[PDB]
């Protein structure tokens, strides 16, 4: 005979409590949901005790302490808050994930509010109703700059760009001074002739309006460089397919000084008369607004002077009566137009071939026809 096994706490379950235990006989001890065997400070997967000759069990009764899911996983570009008792990771504890708005945005599924609610389940892992152990995903917003340019334009115009007006503008110094825009937190959109000129150390800078500061803000190395196959480096007259993407070695942490730019979705952004900003450098970032011109009035002006390659994948912007220079934009930079409905900034064009860098119209690369190619290289 040996004593009736009594539990130390309350969460312990004695499987099949036999009225008395003789020699050779045994019992086992399990826990309830969300509880585990301990014995001191260890963690047991199972407990058994035999009735060892005299009235003793060969190992003392364990205790079922509460399971601890541990410190929740860090949400990239996001964070979380405890909805239950703060700092408690034990069973029946819940947390609320959230992304660093307005820079990143948690992906939805249609489904909200309860989207970033993870709880400490009985298996010791943070799960959810919809979706199991996988954590949410903070996605960057394309347009929506923190400090958008003023829409009330004045005759007393200030052509100096401030911090946040163009958070997507980047600076490249490959074969010469250049630039482009940001797509997401990893991809750079620019023109192909800044990579393969018609006549390489890459060097990509971004995140500020001062040229001296952009270089102080560190370099951004590149992995793959996808140039559109329609671009011919040797043909020093045709910039067909003047578009390319640049994948950064590491993703960037977005902020008010650094945000992506949206891609065009419908062709209404190319209607005649739409106004678009182009930003560029010299020693500081300047911006000018230019109207998209008649695609036919630009060809008559073009052929009327001397033959170029105005195609449907291209469009022209500017006006002759303007006193600015035709080379007022910056090479590889994007033709930034804002949708007055959704108040987002789309990159409808890319600074490509500007004939006669003195005065007249300016030609760009129509991004809309190349969006499907851009989404292909990025998703890979």
């Amino acid at each position: 005979k040996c004593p009736q096994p009594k539990t130390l706490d309350e969460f312990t379950i004695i499987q099949n409590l036999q009225p008395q235990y003789q020699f050779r006989d045994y019992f086992i001890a399990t826990c309830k949901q969300g509880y585990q065997l301990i014995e001191g400070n260890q963690v047991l997967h199972s407990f058994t005790a035999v009735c060892q000759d005299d009235g003793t069990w060969h190992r003392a009764m364990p205790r079922c302490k509460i399971k601890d899911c541990g410190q929740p996983r860090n949400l990239p570009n996001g964070d979380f808050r405890y909805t239950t008792t703060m700092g408690v990771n034990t069973y029946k504890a819940r947390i609320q994930y959230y992304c660093h708005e307005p820079y990143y945005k948690m992906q939805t599924r249609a489904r909200e509010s309860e989207q970033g609610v993870y709880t400490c389940t009985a298996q010791g892992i943070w799960k959810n109703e919809q979706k199991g152990e996988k954590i949410p995903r903070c996605l960057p917003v394309c347009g929506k700059p923190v400090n958008p340019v003023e829409q009330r334009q004045r005759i007393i115009g200030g052509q100096k760009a401030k911090m946040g007006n163009f958070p997507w503008q980047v600076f490249t110094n490959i074969h010469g001074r250049g630039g482009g825009a940001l797509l997401g937190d990893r991809w750079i959109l620019t023109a192909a002739h800044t990579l393969y000129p018609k006549e390489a150390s890459l060097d990509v800078f971004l995140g500020h309006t001062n040229v001296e500061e952009l270089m102080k803000l560190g370099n951004h190395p590149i992995r793959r460089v996808s140039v559109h196959p329609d671009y011919r480096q040797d043909e020093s007259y045709n910039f067909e397919g003047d578009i390319a993407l640049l994948e950064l070695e590491n993703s960037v942490t977005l902020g008010p000084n650094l945000l992506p730019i949206c891609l065009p979705d419908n062709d209404t952004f190319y209607d005649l008369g739409l106004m678009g900003y182009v930003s560029g450098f010299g020693h500081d970032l300047r911006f000018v607004r230019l109207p998209v011109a008649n695609p036919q009035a630009c060809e008559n002006w073009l052929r009327g002077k001397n033959m170029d390659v105005f195609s449907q994948n291209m469009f022209c912007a500017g006006h002759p009566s303007l006193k600015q220079d035709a080379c007022q934009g910056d090479a590889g930079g994007v033709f930034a137009v804002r949708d007055p409905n959704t108040d987002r900034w789309v990159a409808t064009g890319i600074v490509s071939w500007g004939i006669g860098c003195s005065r007249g119209y300016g030609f760009y690369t129509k991004v809309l026809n190349y969006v499907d190619w851009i989404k292909k290289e990025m998703e890979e």
Binding site: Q153, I155, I156, G157, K162, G273, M275
Partner: protein, 89 residues
């Protein structure tokens, strides 16, 4: 010559927006002394020349009575006849 051409281009972009129906002409006649301060100090005027540029702005907004899309031209000419760009870099 930079200031002159830049103001010409801004006024003519405003005239294009007027022709498209994106900007009301009467709205351009409304600017506060605070907004004039901001626009003049951001582009870099002398703090002493601030009130003089403001006088020029008010006098040129008043001199024009044509509330059509051409006012942006006329006001500009006034800005050039009052020599506003001598106050600007």
């Amino acid at each position: 010559e930079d200031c002159e051409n830049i103001f010409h281009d801004n006024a003519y972009l405003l005239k294009l927006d007027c022709e498209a129906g994106r900007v009301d002409p009467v709205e351009f006649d409304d600017i506060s002394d605070e907004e004039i301060y901001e626009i003049t100090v951001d582009v870099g005027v002398s703090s002493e020349d601030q009130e003089k540029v403001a006088k020029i702005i008010r006098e040129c907004i008043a001199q024009v009575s044509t509330q059509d899309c051409t006012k942006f031209s006329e006001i500009y000419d006034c800005y050039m006849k009052k020599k506003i760009c001598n106050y600007y870099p």
